[PDB]
Every structure is written in structure tokens, then in C-alpha cells.
DNA sequence: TAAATATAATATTTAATATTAATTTT
DNA sequence: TATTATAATATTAAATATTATATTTA
DNA sequence: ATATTATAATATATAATAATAAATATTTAATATTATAATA
């Protein structure tokens, strides 16, 4: 419902912030990595925010980039992950580091973050392995298909013949020979 | 709580928006039909936002003019309609298109929109014809007749109100079914 | 959480109302008597607003004065009646004649106000017998 | 969530206030001790407020100082104390007086506050004994 | 939870009935149609039942038939139907006649039910249209396989096979009697 | 959900009871009048019961008559009436005396029932004048 | 709902128990003191039990004596006391021993109970001292 | 509140049942294996029933053995597991291979159960490996491939292969006796 | 002065589990 | 000229236990 | 001796039906009130 604020840092204190917007200063909590990048009190700062909406109390959580807020929304949409758990997470590691650790299924790099046990690593890897894949049927097979089409095979029959056996680590000329020798 | 925001389009990321008013940006989601007429980033825009209050989240839903604003709030007032349903409906086609189709009662225009199936289409038709859209924004013979019509391609509603309009009383089947066949023309 | 509003009249679509304040428009619900008191569209006018909160939405109530707002609060504090019967009551009559009527304990004048029968009229009388002062 | 509020005092009505922050005047109630520090109507006054969110209401409680707001948060964090008990504690006595008497484990200085019995006093002292090792 | 009761009737105050099952009475209502099938005070009765759990109340509903319970449950699963509406509907008309009217999708026979609006009638008919279904021995299996080989569906064959001939009859005559039917 | 309970009195701790029905003994809350109509411990007895259901507890309120259960249902069907309030109502005096009082608008006799103020008594009078409708 | 239950023991897997009362086996939890007060499996045994009602589940809490169940209900009525905590308390200590520890301000005996902090122990002290006036 | 019921099977329609326990019948939904090991309608039986409570509904899910009931309990204790998923997985297969596949970290065994995705089963592995602390041949596929390439329809050929497999005899002879079925 | 009694005001989550620090033994 | 059953609509919704402490009446 | 083309098969683009998995939406019960049709 809220995406970003242009205000003035009326007061900083770990780990929250006060952003005086037209006389109105909002309680905004930020991670330590963001806190390091912030200028002094009274400076306009670029925080892209998301509000956590709970029945008894809300939470304003801003970030210097859209990507941080979006990944925090992904982390809070998770089953057993709360907000300040993920705040500790990107306080410990950056977006590229976390993304590469997920793609490498790394646990040792991220268990240094406090509050993270083995089951924390298990749940974060199992969710983030398939929630996002790219973060911001072969050339030899096609040559074989074209060669068998020129040899008289139908394109469907050539596709079936080249998909009949899983040729690996072999040249285009020899893979046709081993596929043609395969079924026969 | 929110009706209108005299402010500038801080960001444009489909389908969401950030609309800056005095430095305050808001997470605003609008249909694609709105996105066609939305000007460049930073330009002061005209967009009637709508708040939906949940126990877990809130979102803002902008509209260019009052007519689709009222259309959206009345559609969400239905028991079966959620926000993304009406968002897809407005993204697919315009208010005049949907009202002129509903008064024509064709589901085919409704169902080509992605995420819109048949059942949603007769729900829209029935529950809008249920008083919102006047303004722009048996016996053995009759049962035998109905069964014959079902066996001859008639859907039961046109076999039903034809019987209701011209019922047959104490006389043989062949003539009131004949005048009913003249009746449905 | 909100007590008063001071902004320019964005538009006039009764019985709803939009007040454009710092470029931000608020949906407020307004009495007909206040509709007789509103200026032209585009006029900076002060509205003394009260919010009601339910589980799925909220409604504001922009008012041109205080004591009408506190009498709204006192009425809606009753479990038997909600805000919109109060809207019908306040569109029916103003503060002083309502005060003398409840002090005179008459249901008949409350009957003519639309949407109100008899039993809710003595509900208003019984409940507001001993709540407020005469001002 | 407003952590600090700085607007002009639109009107004064005990125990509440209306702070017209560029057109919007919030229903804000502050303790009487802050009311002694409150300037007249129309002055730009800075409050370190905090919103209390309920299922049917939202309440703003402004504070001229950050630490009194922090103590308000500690008091409302207690299982039996809501906003108005902490309001009575803030209005009756001063923060340093509270911390000295908690270090002194006093009870009479607490019970003498109106609306406060022996039960609430012994509560606040014994569930507050564990804290304030940091200061 | 509750699926059926086999207890003794205690008192009759229509529509509210009390069913003393082993010392404890059960607050259950039955439709006036079921009032035309209740026994006397003190007589045992078996009622097919199904409960409804509300935020502040639990309501017990018991019918003479299990199929009536299932139709009631499917009516309650509808978004605009409360128990009072379903009781009004079934107090107006009985079950299979309402089923055929749902096949008919006609509002005339259901408007006459008191307290029922026409808009309610068409919305319930449209959202209740027919998506549901319409309301072994050696010789049995041999006939089923023979009619499967003859092209008849196994469910279609079985209902013609097991209906007319008796139990453990000669396979030829019972296949003959099963194929006696026409559409 | 239970409108009648033919059980055996297992325990007698007024105003609560245990009716051991086939080894199952539920908590049974009865008024002091029903306590006078109550037999001794171990006596089989039929109580005409009512259920109250809220989000954290269920209670049983067993009565000697149908009409007692129905009247208790219609008093708790009111907005501002709790269970113990109506318990004190029929504990103070008899049912038909209550019917005569509300048909005669006798607030005084209803005031002498303990736990009942003048305001609550006249509420009961006005919301029960026409609800009985002479049966 | 349930105050007493008289049925035959089907299984004894601590802390869980099932009691086949006329074919109906209710799952129920008792303290270990009650477990050693239990007879063998297959005999009919009478318990003074209590149901805890909430939005997601319903659990039974049996006791060999009614005073144990009463003190259970009084403990659970407190905000900071839960059923697991209370069952641990009465498993560790005798009911009369608990009463004497409350009257004698014996903190350490509640401290030595596993999972119990000294804070929670002195809470138990301070609310029980004015909660029960020695029976 | 409730753990066991001992009554008489008044009615049994899958996947539910009606157990008339002392005059009161309960609709209890039980798995396919349980329905296989249940006795006929009218036979008494004792069932390990688990209490299921929602804010607006309540259910029972009974078992012939307790360990089924506790394993159902920790399955429902997971946020990401509903009752239908647990019922489907226990209806499809037995619990011993379930705990062994949890120890063996097997997924494709769980995936073949209807309604089970790869992510669902792999999550079940992820939390169950920490929850549990103490607690056909080559010729079979060759015959199917040969029949498919010969001209036979793929599923009826596998039906003939699995009707009389060559577990103790050669592939050619089991093809020979598999061609007996369709003649 | 000691409560009585409304009267009004004020207040109102829980289990259940995963981490971590201090301790304990080898 | 009132009078009453029926229906569509449009609201409104559901807390109660526990203290603190006024007058009041001895 | 080359095409050619007048009759003969053919294979798939375009109609259809059948799971299926991501994505949502998630409240009616009681009761005044007001028309309203029919009525001493």
C-alpha cells in the first residue's frame, strides 16, 4: 500500500528511523547494511518501504532499493519465516551473496548469521530453490536433425531417433552414428 | 479512506505503480486499460485509488474516472468476486463493452478474457442483471412436449418459458406444441 | 486517530464526499444538513472528521462542527444502533431540537425521521436520558 | 506508525488535542504533564507519538520526549496494563520518580494515584523489577 | 462429528425437536414435511443427521433420509444459502421434485415458497444445475463381462443385470432378462 | 445443543451440579430456585438444559421447565444481558411475577433483585413489554 | 462442560489416557501424581476432569479429586499460567504442599520445578496469596 | 477430547463410515487401507479416532492402529499439510514404507500417490528427517517395450505383462502366457 | 470509619518450537 | 377510512471479568 | 524419353475431450423499516 518515501531523517537510532515527512515522522526499522549507507540526521534519504500489517501492530520496513523490499516480501511470504529473521538475513549477507548461496545450496556461509540453525538453512534453501530461478533441443541435436532430414528421415522420425538415446560428450558426426547404431 | 491523489507517477512497474504525493509514494495496482493512458514517470496523474482492508495487508487500486471506480466497488461487493477478477475484467475490456454485452447476455465476450471461465460469466450476467444495469455507468402432455424439445436440440429454458407463456389446457398435445413453435418465433 | 481535516473541495457526489487535502483525497460521509452548509467545489473548507473501524473497511465522517461529532460518538457507542441510522437521525434534525426532544421524551418526532420506527425512538430516549448535559 | 509528529495545534480540549499537520488534524491524547509543556493553539509543537492499533479503533498518544514514549511502550507491554493505566501513571508522576521508586520498591507513591489500587502497584513494581539494568 | 441418530423421541414442539438418546436429549429441528413422518412422543426413531458449526453456536439438523442430508449440505455449501432458506425450500417441496425442477431451472414452482425472492431462485438454480449424478456372483460377473464385450458400459450393464433376475440364476436366462431393456 | 438431560445427581456444589449420565458427569449450573426443586445427591432427575457457546468456554445451564429455558434464551438474546445477570433475575423472584412486573412496568420490584440497577431494570421492562406479546 | 467422568481405562501412555465410557474413549491428560494414583488398565475409574475450549482443539484434564480440578481452573484463569505449566506444577508438588508454599512464601520449591523461572514462581505467590484466603 | 470409539458400523460409504456408538452415529472419514481392513456393515469395531476442529467445522479421522493416529497428528502439525493430503498419502500406501523412505530420502515413491507434487513430498522429507528421532525386473520392462514396438496399446500391454509377470520364468514365456489374456 | 453496591472504567490472547548461552563431562 | 400478513431491503452485529472508587448507611 | 496428369491413396490442421496445478476468496443471522397488496 506504500512503496517509497521522500522525507527527512529526523532521528536515527539502532535499528529504527524517524522520517519527518511534512512534519510527520514515521517509525521505520532498517537493517544494519542499510544503516551503514545512510547519511546523517536531517538528510533526505531514499527508502523503498513495505508495511507489515498485523491486527495489533504494524511494521514499517524500508530499503534503499526496490530489489531488497521485493526479496523481503518473498521471504515474509514464506511459511515459517518472520520479518526480523529475514532482517537478520540481509543484515548478514547481501542480495548477490544470498542468491548465489541459494543457487549453490550453501549453508556454511549463512549459518554465521545469528538465529540461523540447520533447519533454518533447510527451509530457506527448499523455498528459494524453486521460488526464483533466474535472478537479475541442442545445437548438435539440431544439426543431427537437419542431417537426417537431408538423409531422407522425416523430422518427427529424426527427432524420435535423436531422442531415443542420450548421446553425451560426443561430436555431431559420431552421435548420429551411435544413435543410428543404437536401436538397430 | 482514499479516493484521489493529486500526485506524480514516481514509478511504473506493471501492473503496480508508485504515485508520489508530497514525497509519499504508495503501492498502487491498476488495470492494463488504465496503463495505456498513464503518462510518463514523474508526471502528475489523475487516478482514483481504492483501499481494500484486510487483517493481513492493504493495497491501492487506481481508476481513471468515476464510472469504473463505481463499477469496481460494486463488482467487489459481490460474494464471489475478488480484486484480481475485476482487474482482469477491466484490463480485457471497457465498461461500455461489458454493459452492452450483459444487456445482450453473451458469455462468449466474457470468457475470452484470461482467468474468466463459463461459471464466472453467468455469475456476472445474473448478478448484474439482478438490478444494477438499467443506467449506463406439469401435465403429461407438457412433459412430453418438453422431452421432445430436449430430444430436438432445445435447451430446457426455452422449452420451459414457451410452455409457461402458452400453456395447454384439456386438449391434445399436437396443437399447443404447434402454436408454441409458432410462439417462440 | 483523526479529529479534524482542512482541505479543498475536490468534488461533490452526495451522500459521499471527497476532500482533497495536500493533494490527498478522503472519502467521508456527510449529513444532508451539512450538505446545506458546504461551499462550492474547490473551496478550502475545514471538516471535523471521525473514523469508524470494522474488520474489512472503514468510513470517515466529515463534520462542520464539534458537538455534532461527539453526539455521533455517544450514539454509535450504543450496541443496538449503528452509524447509518445516526446519519438518518442527523439528516432529520439538528442538535438543539433533538436535545429538547429527548429531554421532552417524545418518540413521535423521531418517527417522522426516515428509517426510524417507534421502538428505536424510545431506544434513543432511554439510552440518552442521562448521558449528556444541556450545553 | 508515526514515530514523531510536528504540526500546529489546531485546538485544545482536555485531555485530547488536534495537531493540524499541513491540513490534517489528528485526534491525539497526551498526559497532563505534557499539557503543562503544551503551548497555546496555533503553535508548531513536536510530539514523539505512537499509534495503538485495535480491531475497531486506532489511538495516537503524543509525547514531548522520546523516553516517556519508551516508558509508555514498556508499560503497555505489561500483560494487564493498557493505554489508560499507563496514561494515569504518566499524568500522576514523573519518569525519574518512577525509576527511583522502583529501585526503592515503593508502593505508597503509586497507590496514591487515582484509579490505582494495591494490586496494580505491586504488579507494576514486581514485573518492572527485572528491567532497568541498562538505563 | 454427527452423521446419524438412532434414539427415542422425548417431546414435540415444532419445528424444534428433542431426542433423548440414552439419557441426554438432542436439540434438533426437522422440516414440516418430516413432521408428517415423525412418530409419537416416547417412540424411537432413526434420523439421518448433520451438524452445523457457527462462530457462536452449534446447530443440529436431522432428516429422515441420508440423501436429504447430502442435498442439505450441498445447499449450505452455496455462498448465498443459509439453513433457514434450505428449510423453507424443503418445507415447500420434496427432494426429487426439487431435483427435477433444478433440471428444469424453473422459478415459478419455487417462488411460491414463502419468503423466497425470485433473484434467490435463479441464482440457486444456476449454481445448483446438474453437475452431480441424477437421482458379484459368477452369473453377475459373466453377464457384466459379456455386455462389456457387447459394448455396454460396466455401470450401465450392472444395473440392468442385477435388477430384474434373482440371485444365482442360469446365466443365459439372466443375460436375456438383462438385455430385455430398451431406451 | 442439549435441550433436556435425564441424569443422576453426582455432585452438589451450588450453584453448580454434576449429572452423571451413563458415567459421563457434566458441569450443570442451576439457579437457587431450581436448587429448591432439586432432589438430593444420587437422585435421578431430568433437567431441561441450554447451551452457551463462546470462543474459549462452553457451559451448561439446566432448568426444571421448558419455559425457563426459552425465557433464558430470549433474555440472553438481548444485547446488554449476560448469563449471570439473567441467572440473578430468575434467582431473585419467580417467572410469572417477572411477566406480571413487565406487563405492569414494575421497575421497583425488579430493582430489589440483587445485582440489578434501575437502568438495567427499565431496559428489561422496555425490551420485554412487547416481546412476550401475551404469548 | 465435563466435570466428572466414570469409565474404564483402555490405555495408559503418559501423559495421555483414554477412558472407554460405553464405547466412547475420551483422550485426557492427568498429572503424574494422578498417574501413580491410577489403578490398572481395564477397570472402571472415576475422574474429576475439565475441558479446555478454543478455536482449534479441545483437550481434557482429569484429576482424581475435585479440588485439584478447581485449583487447575483457578490457575488457568490467570493470564501468565498455562495448562502445561500448571500440570507441571501439580506434578512436581502436592496440592496442600503448594498451598503451604504459597502461604509461607516458599519460592525455591517452585524454583526447583523444571522449566519454572523464579519470576513465574513469585507471580504464582503474589496472585495466589490474594486469590485464595486459605480455603 | 476424543481418542477412541467402540460402536457398531451402521453405514459405510467411502471414504466415510457411520459407527453407531451407543445409539449415536458418527460420520468418520477413513483411508482406503482402513476401509479394506474394516469389517462389514453392522459389525462392532474399535477405532483410533483423531479429533479435528475448525472454527466453523469439526471432523474425525479414525484408524485401526494408534501409530497411524500419531503420525497423522504430526503430519497435521505441519502448517503446509492439510487433512486431504495426509488422507491421500496414507490411503495410497502403507506406513512402514513411508518411514523407510523417510529414512531412505525417497521422493518418487511419494510422488506417485495422487495429489502429491515433487515439492510436497520433498518438503515432507525435509521436516520428517528431523521429526523422526527414534520411532518387477528388467524383463518386466523389456516385455512392455517389445509389446509397444510390436503394435500393442501401451496400457493394456502393461496390464497383460503385470497380470502374470515373469518373476520366476523367462521373458519370452511370460509374454507367451500374457498373450493368453486378450486371446 | 468500614464496607455494599452498583457504576463505570479498563482491560482482555495462547502453544509451540527453534536458537543460544552457560554448564557438564572426557 | 384504518389494518395486517408478506416481502424486499438495509443495517448491525458479539464480548465480559476485574478492580477503583463514588455515595451511603450505618 | 519426358512429362503429365486423370484418377488412386494419404497425415495432419483443426474441431473436440480430460486431468492439473497455480491462484485465489474466504459471513451470514436476526431484526426493524418501509412498501405493498389485500382487506372490515
mmCIF file with all atom_site columns, N, CA and C in Angstrom, chain H residues 145-182:
data_model
loop_
_atom_site.group_PDB
_atom_site.id
_atom_site.type_symbol
_atom_site.label_atom_id
_atom_site.label_alt_id
_atom_site.label_comp_id
_atom_site.label_asym_id
_atom_site.label_entity_id
_atom_site.label_seq_id
_atom_site.pdbx_PDB_ins_code
_atom_site.Cartn_x
_atom_site.Cartn_y
_atom_site.Cartn_z
_atom_site.occupancy
_atom_site.B_iso_or_equiv
_atom_site.pdbx_formal_charge
_atom_site.auth_seq_id
_atom_site.auth_comp_id
_atom_site.auth_asym_id
_atom_site.auth_atom_id
_atom_site.pdbx_PDB_model_num
ATOM 1   N N  . UNK H 1 145 ? 8.179  -52.952 -23.487 1.00 0.00 ? 145 UNK H N  1
ATOM 2   C CA . UNK H 1 145 ? 8.751  -52.241 -24.628 1.00 0.00 ? 145 UNK H CA 1
ATOM 3   C C  . UNK H 1 145 ? 8.604  -53.041 -25.919 1.00 0.00 ? 145 UNK H C  1
ATOM 4   N N  . UNK H 1 146 ? 8.822  -54.359 -25.852 1.00 0.00 ? 146 UNK H N  1
ATOM 5   C CA . UNK H 1 146 ? 8.679  -55.202 -27.033 1.00 0.00 ? 146 UNK H CA 1
ATOM 6   C C  . UNK H 1 146 ? 7.238  -55.231 -27.524 1.00 0.00 ? 146 UNK H C  1
ATOM 7   N N  . UNK H 1 147 ? 6.275  -55.291 -26.603 1.00 0.00 ? 147 UNK H N  1
ATOM 8   C CA . UNK H 1 147 ? 4.872  -55.264 -27.000 1.00 0.00 ? 147 UNK H CA 1
ATOM 9   C C  . UNK H 1 147 ? 4.472  -53.906 -27.561 1.00 0.00 ? 147 UNK H C  1
ATOM 10  N N  . UNK H 1 148 ? 5.012  -52.819 -27.005 1.00 0.00 ? 148 UNK H N  1
ATOM 11  C CA . UNK H 1 148 ? 4.716  -51.485 -27.521 1.00 0.00 ? 148 UNK H CA 1
ATOM 12  C C  . UNK H 1 148 ? 5.255  -51.330 -28.939 1.00 0.00 ? 148 UNK H C  1
ATOM 13  N N  . UNK H 1 149 ? 6.496  -51.766 -29.167 1.00 0.00 ? 149 UNK H N  1
ATOM 14  C CA . UNK H 1 149 ? 7.075  -51.667 -30.503 1.00 0.00 ? 149 UNK H CA 1
ATOM 15  C C  . UNK H 1 149 ? 6.427  -52.643 -31.476 1.00 0.00 ? 149 UNK H C  1
ATOM 16  N N  . UNK H 1 150 ? 5.893  -53.759 -30.970 1.00 0.00 ? 150 UNK H N  1
ATOM 17  C CA . UNK H 1 150 ? 5.209  -54.720 -31.829 1.00 0.00 ? 150 UNK H CA 1
ATOM 18  C C  . UNK H 1 150 ? 3.925  -54.136 -32.406 1.00 0.00 ? 150 UNK H C  1
ATOM 19  N N  . UNK H 1 151 ? 3.200  -53.352 -31.615 1.00 0.00 ? 151 UNK H N  1
ATOM 20  C CA . UNK H 1 151 ? 1.956  -52.764 -32.071 1.00 0.00 ? 151 UNK H CA 1
ATOM 21  C C  . UNK H 1 151 ? 0.905  -52.694 -30.985 1.00 0.00 ? 151 UNK H C  1
ATOM 22  N N  . UNK H 1 152 ? 1.181  -53.282 -29.824 1.00 0.00 ? 152 UNK H N  1
ATOM 23  C CA . UNK H 1 152 ? 0.194  -53.308 -28.738 1.00 0.00 ? 152 UNK H CA 1
ATOM 24  C C  . UNK H 1 152 ? -0.014 -51.957 -28.069 1.00 0.00 ? 152 UNK H C  1
ATOM 25  N N  . UNK H 1 153 ? -1.242 -51.687 -27.630 1.00 0.00 ? 153 UNK H N  1
ATOM 26  C CA . UNK H 1 153 ? -1.520 -50.436 -26.929 1.00 0.00 ? 153 UNK H CA 1
ATOM 27  C C  . UNK H 1 153 ? -0.732 -50.430 -25.628 1.00 0.00 ? 153 UNK H C  1
ATOM 28  N N  . UNK H 1 154 ? -0.108 -49.295 -25.292 1.00 0.00 ? 154 UNK H N  1
ATOM 29  C CA . UNK H 1 154 ? 0.761  -49.247 -24.107 1.00 0.00 ? 154 UNK H CA 1
ATOM 30  C C  . UNK H 1 154 ? 0.204  -49.614 -22.733 1.00 0.00 ? 154 UNK H C  1
ATOM 31  N N  . UNK H 1 155 ? -1.087 -49.433 -22.457 1.00 0.00 ? 155 UNK H N  1
ATOM 32  C CA . UNK H 1 155 ? -1.545 -49.679 -21.091 1.00 0.00 ? 155 UNK H CA 1
ATOM 33  C C  . UNK H 1 155 ? -2.127 -51.084 -20.948 1.00 0.00 ? 155 UNK H C  1
ATOM 34  N N  . UNK H 1 156 ? -2.820 -51.577 -21.975 1.00 0.00 ? 156 UNK H N  1
ATOM 35  C CA . UNK H 1 156 ? -3.298 -52.955 -21.957 1.00 0.00 ? 156 UNK H CA 1
ATOM 36  C C  . UNK H 1 156 ? -2.165 -53.962 -22.108 1.00 0.00 ? 156 UNK H C  1
ATOM 37  N N  . UNK H 1 157 ? -1.098 -53.596 -22.826 1.00 0.00 ? 157 UNK H N  1
ATOM 38  C CA . UNK H 1 157 ? 0.086  -54.446 -22.875 1.00 0.00 ? 157 UNK H CA 1
ATOM 39  C C  . UNK H 1 157 ? 0.726  -54.566 -21.499 1.00 0.00 ? 157 UNK H C  1
ATOM 40  N N  . UNK H 1 158 ? 0.839  -53.447 -20.778 1.00 0.00 ? 158 UNK H N  1
ATOM 41  C CA . UNK H 1 158 ? 1.355  -53.499 -19.414 1.00 0.00 ? 158 UNK H CA 1
ATOM 42  C C  . UNK H 1 158 ? 0.408  -54.244 -18.483 1.00 0.00 ? 158 UNK H C  1
ATOM 43  N N  . UNK H 1 159 ? -0.901 -54.164 -18.736 1.00 0.00 ? 159 UNK H N  1
ATOM 44  C CA . UNK H 1 159 ? -1.864 -54.956 -17.973 1.00 0.00 ? 159 UNK H CA 1
ATOM 45  C C  . UNK H 1 159 ? -1.629 -56.449 -18.176 1.00 0.00 ? 159 UNK H C  1
ATOM 46  N N  . UNK H 1 160 ? -1.399 -56.866 -19.424 1.00 0.00 ? 160 UNK H N  1
ATOM 47  C CA . UNK H 1 160 ? -1.112 -58.271 -19.697 1.00 0.00 ? 160 UNK H CA 1
ATOM 48  C C  . UNK H 1 160 ? 0.212  -58.697 -19.075 1.00 0.00 ? 160 UNK H C  1
ATOM 49  N N  . UNK H 1 161 ? 1.213  -57.815 -19.117 1.00 0.00 ? 161 UNK H N  1
ATOM 50  C CA . UNK H 1 161 ? 2.512  -58.109 -18.519 1.00 0.00 ? 161 UNK H CA 1
ATOM 51  C C  . UNK H 1 161 ? 2.398  -58.269 -17.004 1.00 0.00 ? 161 UNK H C  1
ATOM 52  N N  . UNK H 1 162 ? 1.661  -57.372 -16.343 1.00 0.00 ? 162 UNK H N  1
ATOM 53  C CA . UNK H 1 162 ? 1.571  -57.407 -14.888 1.00 0.00 ? 162 UNK H CA 1
ATOM 54  C C  . UNK H 1 162 ? 0.521  -58.388 -14.382 1.00 0.00 ? 162 UNK H C  1
ATOM 55  N N  . UNK H 1 163 ? -0.339 -58.911 -15.260 1.00 0.00 ? 163 UNK H N  1
ATOM 56  C CA . UNK H 1 163 ? -1.320 -59.903 -14.828 1.00 0.00 ? 163 UNK H CA 1
ATOM 57  C C  . UNK H 1 163 ? -0.639 -61.205 -14.426 1.00 0.00 ? 163 UNK H C  1
ATOM 58  N N  . UNK H 1 164 ? 0.283  -61.685 -15.254 1.00 0.00 ? 164 UNK H N  1
ATOM 59  C CA . UNK H 1 164 ? 1.103  -62.849 -14.931 1.00 0.00 ? 164 UNK H CA 1
ATOM 60  C C  . UNK H 1 164 ? 2.570  -62.542 -15.251 1.00 0.00 ? 164 UNK H C  1
ATOM 61  N N  . UNK H 1 165 ? 3.270  -61.847 -14.353 1.00 0.00 ? 165 UNK H N  1
ATOM 62  C CA . UNK H 1 165 ? 4.655  -61.457 -14.640 1.00 0.00 ? 165 UNK H CA 1
ATOM 63  C C  . UNK H 1 165 ? 5.597  -62.649 -14.667 1.00 0.00 ? 165 UNK H C  1
ATOM 64  N N  . UNK H 1 166 ? 6.754  -62.438 -15.290 1.00 0.00 ? 166 UNK H N  1
ATOM 65  C CA . UNK H 1 166 ? 7.794  -63.446 -15.328 1.00 0.00 ? 166 UNK H CA 1
ATOM 66  C C  . UNK H 1 166 ? 8.779  -63.306 -14.189 1.00 0.00 ? 166 UNK H C  1
ATOM 67  N N  . UNK H 1 167 ? 8.269  -63.321 -12.956 1.00 0.00 ? 167 UNK H N  1
ATOM 68  C CA . UNK H 1 167 ? 9.138  -63.190 -11.793 1.00 0.00 ? 167 UNK H CA 1
ATOM 69  C C  . UNK H 1 167 ? 10.018 -64.421 -11.616 1.00 0.00 ? 167 UNK H C  1
ATOM 70  N N  . UNK H 1 168 ? 9.496  -65.603 -11.953 1.00 0.00 ? 168 UNK H N  1
ATOM 71  C CA . UNK H 1 168 ? 10.224 -66.856 -11.785 1.00 0.00 ? 168 UNK H CA 1
ATOM 72  C C  . UNK H 1 168 ? 10.437 -67.582 -13.109 1.00 0.00 ? 168 UNK H C  1
ATOM 73  N N  . UNK H 1 169 ? 10.302 -66.885 -14.234 1.00 0.00 ? 169 UNK H N  1
ATOM 74  C CA . UNK H 1 169 ? 10.430 -67.513 -15.541 1.00 0.00 ? 169 UNK H CA 1
ATOM 75  C C  . UNK H 1 169 ? 10.815 -66.454 -16.570 1.00 0.00 ? 169 UNK H C  1
ATOM 76  N N  . UNK H 1 170 ? 11.200 -66.925 -17.754 1.00 0.00 ? 170 UNK H N  1
ATOM 77  C CA . UNK H 1 170 ? 11.833 -66.077 -18.757 1.00 0.00 ? 170 UNK H CA 1
ATOM 78  C C  . UNK H 1 170 ? 10.842 -65.081 -19.355 1.00 0.00 ? 170 UNK H C  1
ATOM 79  N N  . UNK H 1 171 ? 11.396 -64.073 -20.038 1.00 0.00 ? 171 UNK H N  1
ATOM 80  C CA . UNK H 1 171 ? 10.574 -63.019 -20.625 1.00 0.00 ? 171 UNK H CA 1
ATOM 81  C C  . UNK H 1 171 ? 9.720  -63.534 -21.778 1.00 0.00 ? 171 UNK H C  1
ATOM 82  N N  . UNK H 1 172 ? 10.272 -64.425 -22.608 1.00 0.00 ? 172 UNK H N  1
ATOM 83  C CA . UNK H 1 172 ? 9.504  -64.962 -23.727 1.00 0.00 ? 172 UNK H CA 1
ATOM 84  C C  . UNK H 1 172 ? 8.321  -65.798 -23.251 1.00 0.00 ? 172 UNK H C  1
ATOM 85  N N  . UNK H 1 173 ? 8.495  -66.587 -22.189 1.00 0.00 ? 173 UNK H N  1
ATOM 86  C CA . UNK H 1 173 ? 7.394  -67.400 -21.688 1.00 0.00 ? 173 UNK H CA 1
ATOM 87  C C  . UNK H 1 173 ? 6.339  -66.563 -20.979 1.00 0.00 ? 173 UNK H C  1
ATOM 88  N N  . UNK H 1 174 ? 6.740  -65.490 -20.295 1.00 0.00 ? 174 UNK H N  1
ATOM 89  C CA . UNK H 1 174 ? 5.727  -64.644 -19.678 1.00 0.00 ? 174 UNK H CA 1
ATOM 90  C C  . UNK H 1 174 ? 4.992  -63.810 -20.715 1.00 0.00 ? 174 UNK H C  1
ATOM 91  N N  . UNK H 1 175 ? 5.646  -63.456 -21.824 1.00 0.00 ? 175 UNK H N  1
ATOM 92  C CA . UNK H 1 175 ? 4.918  -62.878 -22.953 1.00 0.00 ? 175 UNK H CA 1
ATOM 93  C C  . UNK H 1 175 ? 3.945  -63.902 -23.531 1.00 0.00 ? 175 UNK H C  1
ATOM 94  N N  . UNK H 1 176 ? 4.388  -65.159 -23.638 1.00 0.00 ? 176 UNK H N  1
ATOM 95  C CA . UNK H 1 176 ? 3.542  -66.236 -24.147 1.00 0.00 ? 176 UNK H CA 1
ATOM 96  C C  . UNK H 1 176 ? 2.282  -66.408 -23.305 1.00 0.00 ? 176 UNK H C  1
ATOM 97  N N  . UNK H 1 177 ? 2.419  -66.354 -21.980 1.00 0.00 ? 177 UNK H N  1
ATOM 98  C CA . UNK H 1 177 ? 1.250  -66.513 -21.118 1.00 0.00 ? 177 UNK H CA 1
ATOM 99  C C  . UNK H 1 177 ? 0.503  -65.195 -20.913 1.00 0.00 ? 177 UNK H C  1
ATOM 100 N N  . UNK H 1 178 ? 1.130  -64.062 -21.241 1.00 0.00 ? 178 UNK H N  1
ATOM 101 C CA . UNK H 1 178 ? 0.434  -62.781 -21.182 1.00 0.00 ? 178 UNK H CA 1
ATOM 102 C C  . UNK H 1 178 ? -0.482 -62.590 -22.380 1.00 0.00 ? 178 UNK H C  1
ATOM 103 N N  . UNK H 1 179 ? -0.105 -63.144 -23.533 1.00 0.00 ? 179 UNK H N  1
ATOM 104 C CA . UNK H 1 179 ? -0.978 -63.125 -24.701 1.00 0.00 ? 179 UNK H CA 1
ATOM 105 C C  . UNK H 1 179 ? -2.191 -64.039 -24.555 1.00 0.00 ? 179 UNK H C  1
ATOM 106 N N  . UNK H 1 180 ? -2.264 -64.830 -23.480 1.00 0.00 ? 180 UNK H N  1
ATOM 107 C CA . UNK H 1 180 ? -3.476 -65.588 -23.180 1.00 0.00 ? 180 UNK H CA 1
ATOM 108 C C  . UNK H 1 180 ? -4.657 -64.674 -22.877 1.00 0.00 ? 180 UNK H C  1
ATOM 109 N N  . UNK H 1 181 ? -4.403 -63.520 -22.252 1.00 0.00 ? 181 UNK H N  1
ATOM 110 C CA . UNK H 1 181 ? -5.490 -62.715 -21.715 1.00 0.00 ? 181 UNK H CA 1
ATOM 111 C C  . UNK H 1 181 ? -6.408 -62.129 -22.772 1.00 0.00 ? 181 UNK H C  1
ATOM 112 N N  . UNK H 1 182 ? -5.839 -61.474 -23.786 1.00 0.00 ? 182 UNK H N  1
ATOM 113 C CA . UNK H 1 182 ? -6.679 -60.852 -24.804 1.00 0.00 ? 182 UNK H CA 1
ATOM 114 C C  . UNK H 1 182 ? -6.987 -61.812 -25.945 1.00 0.00 ? 182 UNK H C  1
#
